[PDB]
Ligand binder design. Structure first.
Ligand SMILES: O=c1ccn([C@@H]2O[C@H](COP(=O)(O)OP(=O)(O)O[C@H]3O[C@H](CO)[C@H](O)[C@H](O)[C@H]3O)[C@@H](O)[C@H]2O)c(=O)[nH]1
Ligand SMILES: O=c1ccn([C@@H]2O[C@H](COP(=O)(O)OP(=O)(O)O[C@H]3O[C@H](CO)[C@H](O)[C@H](O)[C@H]3O)[C@@H](O)[C@H]2O)c(=O)[nH]1
Ligand SMILES: [Ca+2]
Ligand SMILES: [Ca+2]
Ligand SMILES: [Cl-]
Ligand SMILES: [Cl-]
Ligand SMILES: [Cl-]
Ligand SMILES: [Cl-]
Ligand SMILES: [Cl-]
Ligand SMILES: [Cl-]
Ligand SMILES: [Cl-]
Ligand SMILES: [Hg+2]
Ligand SMILES: [Hg+2]
Ligand SMILES: [Hg+2]
Ligand SMILES: [Hg+2]
Ligand SMILES: [Hg+2]
Ligand SMILES: [Hg+2]
Ligand SMILES: [Hg+2]
Ligand SMILES: [Hg+2]
Ligand SMILES: [Hg+2]
Lengths: 520, 518
């Protein structure tokens, strides 16, 4: 008699979470873990926290209490004191006692998974955002013994190495950039994975894996990730990294003598990078992130141009500026296409005689017309209200890490030197890259702006706002990203610089640039 | 790079034990030798209401094997030693039913909480001889599957039918399955005693040993309550008889005794030693010593060829297991005798004898076997043994052999019967009508035509009567000479050679001994 067997229950996963100074990331990080599409009754939690300067253990304790009954089991190993290691130089310094402790901890979680008869153990670093709720299911689907999902960072850094040096050190290989950029998809054999990975405790070879102590043959640096990677070689366990689709994001590690504020702002940029192409990563419905209070970054006004019909560009920028604690005045963009020929003449608008597109040879467009009038209105607002220094934003731009501190420290450097400036580029397209642009003395990270090509973000002074308006550019209409290089006298074509007489604009540019385009 | 093999599935073995010290050495030994990784095996043991030292045997064993297994849970309860609503140790009251259901439910919750793949229930007196039984059960990929355990009777750990009220039901399919005529895994409405639950299956979440399903309207029986639970869960129960798995004692009545259970499980060990080597106990438990008596006889002989070492070791184990002591008599190899030594004893075949089956005359094997019995008949008269039991070396002992045989001889001597021979093992040739019973002596009948000499009781008066006929000059096989002496041999040509056939012969009814191979 045939009788159908019911389905197998999902694999039994232990999620091991080591947390130190993670209160900045846990609301977003733990919310992502809650919403993993894996049955919570087939999931167990293992949490260890210690050496905390922030209220990391308090956030964890509240979250665990809220989700304890949903899971197969929960282990909780806090240690309030000491808040820092006796042999450390700072919270971001990986001393030997911190290496040893974290190794011992991962080993304890590994043993705990073995003792509770779990199929898999999943390590997730407290600052690792597992955005894809299917990541755990997808990693189980690969039937590997140690597999890791390639997480995206702001740079080439990711949670895997492509080469090793037979001494344990990092090593670039030609295949890293292809894997990193997902040009080659799949799962690849690599000598190193870290941060987040899945161990298959069904595999018999996993019984020989060990986070601590180092293997008896280990003769490398006292590094936690190196000790484990060497343990996979001895057990002949091939580590794999998969990039078949997007899984999550992670911040790039900081230097030893960095600070907790660096780390909190570093993870905030991760949230920004997510919001470039995704909705904002939501927090847990049981953890609440602290309320932020913004400012104008010491400016007289921070503008943001936006066309009302581009509603999704508006919400994205407001979420990004809010997350960076930056306040803006929304300026309605001049819809250049909605202006008939009569309203164009009503403002004395005439294209510059003989203008041709640098890459197609076309006259000025209605889009570039409405774009020039948008910046033209802001220049009018600057002169009317007498704002001495203002920052101007557009609606499609991504922010660099530590954007707020980095620009504010330039503005306190430009001010302390009494620089006679009109236009400071926060984001442009540098067109003169043969010889380097002349650096501005006594003001670090600032150069004299040569021929640029964009107006994504810039600082303008009241002096510069009058200079632009006094050149009456409405009758000599030229796209705004070319009219500015005409005003500081670095435009390549001289048939354009001839129509404008006085071109005494003091233009500078932040170096490196603090803002880039979204879709480049 | 090649992925390593998967580990074996995680199995929790659940063991309820009450008054099982008689079986735990042999039973626990069978489990510790299961071909299934101990690191992938966990133990769950609960014991209570013990009148024997069951609790001490388990603790002695668990302490010795704790370090070898993934986990060990241990639930003992010394007081009380019996249920307040019971009529005896073998009576299943509602408190006993309720407690046993709670223990199995507790074992199921344990298996679930420790994330085991399977839970294997094994009754404390179930001898899982086959070390691969666990592996085989897992292989069938069933949610509730049981191995068919052999018993001395038609009883096994499954039913083929069930009534609309939850009672046992015979079906035409039970016997073919029970005798391994139809081999395979069959869907049945009831399995118990030893079975495997697949906790990987989502349906197993709905199984519960306790409490009964809210629709349960049947009797408060532990196995039926579980059976109805799988019905509500739509989980099909299976039993597999593809090969020999293990052995099971047949349950006893509510008013049976502990010694009945102890001796009933001993018979399981005897049954194993028929076609299999002896079932060894755990090398971590000391089996209790046994004191053998002569069962009140003046002597117990065992005939055996010195060359048949295999038969000797098997009998000396079955006897020692039953606390029976025998004097070993070396048989006379009638095949190693040349034609000169045959005449040296004054031996002549009875004129005209031939085998009633293939027509052969008396054989050399049938010669020395008569002489071995002939030499024992002499030692009886020489030593003056009033009552003696005579054994051979290919015997199958019935259940409760020692007590049933002693009770018979006690019923005989208290009645003063003029007896000379009492068969204990034989082939009854009168099968049309039952043989004439002996009044006032239960389980004893007058021996009609019989045909074996497996084992028998012989008196001094009867030991003289055989030798008085002087049979060496007119020799038949010894199993045909006796029916001549009590005058039941159908051949009047043979009986005509013996002038006085005055032997008074009897037999136990039913027989207590049968051959190893029929
Ligand atoms: O004493 C400690 C130190 C760290 N952690 C926790 O362990 C993880 C370490 O992640 P960090 O962000 O603090 O460290 P990095 O981002 O700089 O990168 C890390 O990548 C690996 C972790 O996956 C190795 O730990 C490596 O040495 C280390 O540089 C985090 O979950 C952190 O919260 C602790 O619980 N206790
Ligand atoms: O209070 C108790 C009563 C029983 N048992 C245990 O229950 C198991 C089965 O009991 P028995 O072998 O003594 O009883 P049976 O031989 O008659 O076989 C049983 O077969 C089924 C499955 O075991 C049911 O339990 C049924 O009630 C019963 O007949 C044994 O391991 C016994 O040790 C206990 O641990 N504690
Ligand atoms: Ca990190
Ligand atoms: Ca039993
Ligand atoms: Cl430094
Ligand atoms: Cl320093
Ligand atoms: Cl804002
Ligand atoms: Cl113990
Ligand atoms: Cl049978
Ligand atoms: Cl029955
Ligand atoms: Cl003996
Ligand atoms: Hg690679
Ligand atoms: Hg590794
Ligand atoms: Hg430093
Ligand atoms: Hg705003
Ligand atoms: Hg059947
Ligand atoms: Hg059942
Ligand atoms: Hg003996
Ligand atoms: Hg014989
Ligand atoms: Hg028997």
């Amino acid at each position: 008699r045939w009788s159908p067997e019911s389905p197998l229950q999902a694999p039994r996963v232990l999620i091991a979470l080591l947390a130190r100074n993670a209160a900045h990331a846990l609301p977003t990080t733990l919310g992502a873990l809650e919403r993993l599409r894996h049955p919570r009754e087939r999931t167990a939690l293992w949490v260890a926290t210690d050496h905390n300067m922030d209220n990391t253990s308090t956030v964890l304790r509240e979250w665990l209490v809220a989700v304890k009954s949903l899971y197969h089991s929960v282990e909780w190993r806090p240690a309030e004191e000491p808040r820092s290691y006796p042999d450390e130089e700072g919270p971001k310094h990986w001393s030997d006692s911190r290496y040893e402790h974290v190794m011992k901890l991962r080993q304890a979680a590994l043993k705990s998974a073995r003792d509770m008869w779990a199929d898999y153990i999943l390590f997730v670093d407290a600052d690792n955002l597992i955005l894809n709720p299917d990541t755990l299911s997808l990693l189980i689907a690969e039937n590997k013994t140690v597999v890791a999902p390639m997480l995206d960072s702001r740079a080439a850094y990711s949670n895997f190495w492509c080469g090793m040096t037979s001494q344990g050190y990092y090593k670039r290989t030609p295949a890293y950039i292809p894997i990193r950029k997902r040009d080659r998809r799949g799962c690849f054999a690599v000598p190193m994975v870290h941060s987040t990975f899945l161990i298959d405790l069904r595999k018999a070879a996993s019984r020989n894996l060990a986070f601590y102590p180092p293997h008896p043959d280990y003769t490398w640096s006292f590094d936690d990730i190196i000790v484990f990677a060497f343990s996979c070689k001895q057990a002949e366990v091939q580590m794999y990294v998969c990039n078949k689709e997007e899984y999550g994001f992670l911040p790039v590690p900081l230097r030893a003598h960095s600070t907790l504020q660096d780390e909190a702002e570093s993870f905030m940029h991760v949230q920004l990078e997510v919001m470039v192409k995704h909705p904002p990563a939501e927090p847990s419905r049981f953890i609440s992130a602290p309320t932020k209070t913004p400012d104008k970054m010491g400016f007289d006004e921070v503008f943001m141009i936006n066309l009302r019909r581009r509603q999704d560009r508006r919400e994205r920028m407001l979420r990004a500026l809010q997350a960076q604690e930056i306040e803006c005045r929304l300026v309605e963009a001049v819809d250049g296409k909605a202006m008939n020929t009569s309203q164009v003449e009503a403002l004395g608008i005439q294209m510059l005689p003989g203008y041709r597109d640098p890459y197609h040879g076309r006259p000025l467009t209605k889009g570039e017309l409405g774009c020039f009038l948008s910046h033209y209105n802001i220049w009018k607002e600057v002169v009317d209200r007498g704002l001495q220094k203002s920052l101007v934003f557009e609606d499609d731009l991504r922010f660099e890490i530590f954007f707020k501190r980095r620009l504010m420290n330039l503005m306190r450097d430009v001010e302390r030197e009494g620089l006679d400036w009109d236009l400071i580029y926060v984001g442009r397209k540098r067109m003169q890259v043969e010889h380097p642009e002349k650096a501005v003395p006594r003001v670090r990270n600032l150069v004299e702006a040569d021929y640029s090509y964009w107006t994504l973000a810039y600082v303008i002074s009241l002096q510069g706002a009058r200079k632009l308006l006094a050149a009456e550019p409405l009758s000599k209409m030229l796209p705004v990203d070319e009219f500015l290089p005409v005003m500081f006298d670095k435009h390549p074509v001289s048939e354009y610089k001839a129509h404008f007489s006085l071109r005494n604009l003091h233009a500078f540019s932040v170096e490196p640039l603090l803002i880039y385009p979204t879709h480049y």
